[PDB]
Design a protein around this nucleic acid. Sequence first.
DNA 1: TTATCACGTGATAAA
DNA 2: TTATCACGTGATAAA
Lengths: 437, 437
Amino acid sequence: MKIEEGKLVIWINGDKGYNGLAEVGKKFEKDTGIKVTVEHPDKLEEKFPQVAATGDGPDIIFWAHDRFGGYAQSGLLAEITPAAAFQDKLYPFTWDAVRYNGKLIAYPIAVEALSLIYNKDLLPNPPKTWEEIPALDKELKAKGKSALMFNLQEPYFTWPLIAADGGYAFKYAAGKYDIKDVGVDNAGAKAGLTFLVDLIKNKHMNADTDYSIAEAAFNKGETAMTINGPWAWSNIDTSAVNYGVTVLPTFKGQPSKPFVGVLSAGINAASPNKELAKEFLENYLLTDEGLEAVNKDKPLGAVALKSYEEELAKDPRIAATMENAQKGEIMPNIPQMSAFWYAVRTAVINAASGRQTVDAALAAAQTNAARRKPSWRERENNRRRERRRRAVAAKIYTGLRAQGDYNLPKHCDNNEVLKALCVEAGWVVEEDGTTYR
Amino acid sequence: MKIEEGKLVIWINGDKGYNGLAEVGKKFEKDTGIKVTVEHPDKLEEKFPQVAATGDGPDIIFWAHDRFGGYAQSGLLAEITPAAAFQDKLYPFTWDAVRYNGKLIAYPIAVEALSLIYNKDLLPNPPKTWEEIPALDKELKAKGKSALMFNLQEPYFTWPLIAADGGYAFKYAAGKYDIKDVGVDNAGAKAGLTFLVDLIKNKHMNADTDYSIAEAAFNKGETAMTINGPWAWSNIDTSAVNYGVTVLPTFKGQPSKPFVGVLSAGINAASPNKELAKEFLENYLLTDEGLEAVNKDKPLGAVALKSYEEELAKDPRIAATMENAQKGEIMPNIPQMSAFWYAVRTAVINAASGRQTVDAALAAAQTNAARRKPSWRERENNRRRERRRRAVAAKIYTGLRAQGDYNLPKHCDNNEVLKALCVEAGWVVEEDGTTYR
DNA sequence: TTATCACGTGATAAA
DNA sequence: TTATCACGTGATAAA
Ligand SMILES: OC[C@H]1O[C@H](O[C@H]2[C@H](O)[C@@H](O)[C@@H](O)O[C@@H]2CO)[C@H](O)[C@@H](O)[C@@H]1O
Ligand SMILES: OC[C@H]1O[C@H](O[C@H]2[C@H](O)[C@@H](O)[C@@H](O)O[C@@H]2CO)[C@H](O)[C@@H](O)[C@@H]1O
């Protein structure tokens, strides 16, 4: 898709309140005539850097702030320049999450953190430590239930356990993140992931469990605990499960440290609708009535708008979310974040399946998370170099074929030409190419 | 995942009644103690041939019959051997759809065909031809609505229009399909796709429209028509849209010819649960109460079970489905079907976007749909041949380097060794490798 | 059918 | 950093 003047197309993840955001777009259209289409395509955070490099893509893209710095480095986002009065409507730290190289690159919407979700009926007293989960599962298995199921395919859900005992992504020193200092391979990281793998080896968890599998098992009352964000609450509300949201369990006496995301909206740098997107975001979405329509669909978490967050903060589920977010850290937005997430995703999946041990999976993840992505020109230098190496050799064999009179067969590879050249220079070449004078 | 003795894991597409099928699995577990997990992973029809080749994968896989012959050729499915009395409970033609090389390779469940779905309130008199859709869109656009939106990303939804004027997939002659005779590049195929592209060029349809985009626009009353199967009816029931299901529009005075699918269940050839899967499928799912629980979730279409289909056939939506299925054809199940679907998917997307003209997109699709997939041994013959070609050359240069005394530099590519060999034989080599005596 | 060379990125390493 | 050779499949074609 290409965006056109006069219409607004929005991308937002399929687990967010896209139907509520479409209501906000319908009110926008009612007051300005600008149609607003909300879409939730799969892997949007991956498709956007591909399509936006040539002017394609949506007008607005919704994602956690950790992806936007990579978008900004590639020149895909329009600089966000809201009035000082509007910046004051949002919490400063939410603005910090969308500041890259001194510039605001997106509008912050909501603060998201994973928490522990548990079935009050099956488990009135949720556990406080990770270590007492294997025993808890033994009790529930005798009843036909399981202790805990959560998404093992995305390292977002596993990172709180990895980070508890000291595992970290990029070290922050003296005002900046050091991208060569990755801490996914330390003792704290190995201890957390080994406990995860140990849960699978002892049949307390399934390596293939994914989002929908874990969501269904909890919402059907088959498992007593899940780990998820505020977006998942509305599906449990409609189910018959009476649930609570509380602090994540400790590991080795240390709190789980979830990576905190700030759902943000960036404007495509190629959109002839920048003013309309700025108007819709500032005056329609980032208002009480606008965030309410989205929040009633799928809860947003702790919204960046002060006026509406003073209402939402009364929800004890939001207070638990903040409790977990205080125990965690706001994610970096640096372009390296995507390479960090891929490497950890592979490390968690490979160790949970048994394809790799914990030590080997994390050692390679540390190398990958710090691997410098080669520039386009570097790739091009290599391609041209090998193209030139072949062209020189091709010319040589072209000259030997046309001028050697080498008593060649009708069809032969250039190796047979090279062999003929060797005997002419006084060499002996055997069949496997062994050569001597 | 690997399957284990005593439990049943099922894969079914995410647009089908997986929650209803889970109810059937829960009743199974109640009467036998065998837990049954229903999962709907993305692209299951693609993951199954990958994971099942090494013993992984689910116990049972649900898909339209067109994929199963390729699974059977790869040896991934257990032969289905139901008693004669049970075969008689299902319509013979549904059994034919799952017969490959004389053997039954799956249990048939339901017959699916696309129909025309329309909003009765916005459009009480649905159109009968494709040709009158562009004018109909002009009327609805002035009201703020659109005429027709359907999935343009999957060629299943576009094939009825391609096949109307004479386009076909594989020709059937003398009792068999000829896999070298592909008819996606004839005048009938070009005419149907050109009309599709013409709908996009004249702004009546969007090239990027996908399933969820089309489903939402119809279920929100923004478009007057969509093309979908019976699985989509329950989402429109919960919406406020008053809809009807009728025959697909004609093109060039000829009926649209949808490819008819038979939702089938195959048993993994690597499952130590074959008897349990056979028991669950025959005595729990393929019963009235079992198909009812699934059908109440997402409608199945015209079920293969005679006793329950005599009930469902009274539904006028099912009668329209059958009306369309009679105008279409049962899909082949031959292994080439997957290569046919990929080629047409690329042809439709490339022409709808403008990356390729209709003529070029269909010409390449015909070549691809008939392209013989090279055997593993053929791939291996090529790999070894090039490995051997490099090994011979490597030895030669190894001998020249160690015995030439060629006045070489410290580091040089093998091209510089070859150059030195040329002057020793009496040649002149320039820098670009131009050589002569 | 088999065959040759192209092709761009990977594995490895000198510096 | 740049450098070399490996690597398996693609483009092309003789037969
Ligand atoms: O798992 C890697 C993934 O983690 C985070 O993604 C979250 C997202 O922030 C949430 O809003 C929600 O959608 O769950 C996602 C995990 O599936 C990072 O934001 C993302 O960049 C990263 O790839
Ligand atoms: O579009 C190619 C696709 O068409 C059919 O898939 C259908 C399927 O049969 C229906 O049950 C439903 O899920 O919609 C699908 C299209 O998205 C073929 O069965 C399938 O093999 C083919 O790839």
